[PDB]
């Protein structure tokens, strides 16, 4: 932590000469700041939140002053809340996977967003009964979407 050398001086040398002007295309700081309001789920929520998503997805279609009506009015909103919460929980993985092809002309945020769209697919195109850890399935779909984007270049 408290070390100074010529070899360590270089690491600030190059950054100082080059990075006075901000190349915003890779300035991820705002998005990472926004994601940071997150903590990892567990298996119990991994099942419950997907079930809630399915219930709300059914309710929003079926809907097209008594407890029968109140219950579905509740579920329709709760399922969308569940979808949003799960996506927000998994964003960090999208970032960590978007790192893997940076530097080859592609801006990091583009990979982030392509992986995010793949994840937005993953949140709903899923069944809890399969038993797979959701993070691995999310990684699969994020990488698939990122390479689909990389099919265009």
């Amino acid at each position: 932590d408290f070390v100074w050398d010529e070899e360590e001086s270089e690491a600030l040398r190059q950054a100082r000469k080059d990075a006075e002007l901000t190349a915003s295309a890779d300035s991820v700081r705002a998005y990472l700041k926004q994601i940071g309001k997150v903590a990892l789920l567990n298996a119990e929520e991994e099942v419950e939140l997907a079930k809630r998503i399915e219930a709300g997805l059914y309710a929003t279609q079926k809907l097209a002053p008594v407890q029968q009506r109140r219950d579905m009015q509740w579920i329709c909103r709760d399922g969308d809340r569940a979808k949003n919460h799960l996506l927000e929980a998994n964003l960090r993985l999208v970032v960590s996977l978007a790192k893997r092809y940076t530097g080859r002309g592609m801006a990091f945020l583009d990979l982030i967003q392509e992986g995010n769209l793949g994840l937005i697919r993953a949140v709903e195109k899923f069944d809890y009964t399969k038993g797979y850890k959701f993070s691995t399935y999310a990684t699969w779909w994020i990488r698939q979407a990122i390479t689909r984007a990389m099919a265009d270049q």
Binding site: R52, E54, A59, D71, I75, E124
Partner: peptide, 26 residues
């Protein structure tokens, strides 16, 4: 919406909705 009906039977979706409603009423 299509993938939910296609992947699982409507009976399972109805059962899940009923379970959610009960867990909200419990």
């Amino acid at each position: 919406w299509d993938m939910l009906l296609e992947r699982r039977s409507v009976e399972e979706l109805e059962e899940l909705l009923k379970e959610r409603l009960d867990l909200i009423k419990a």
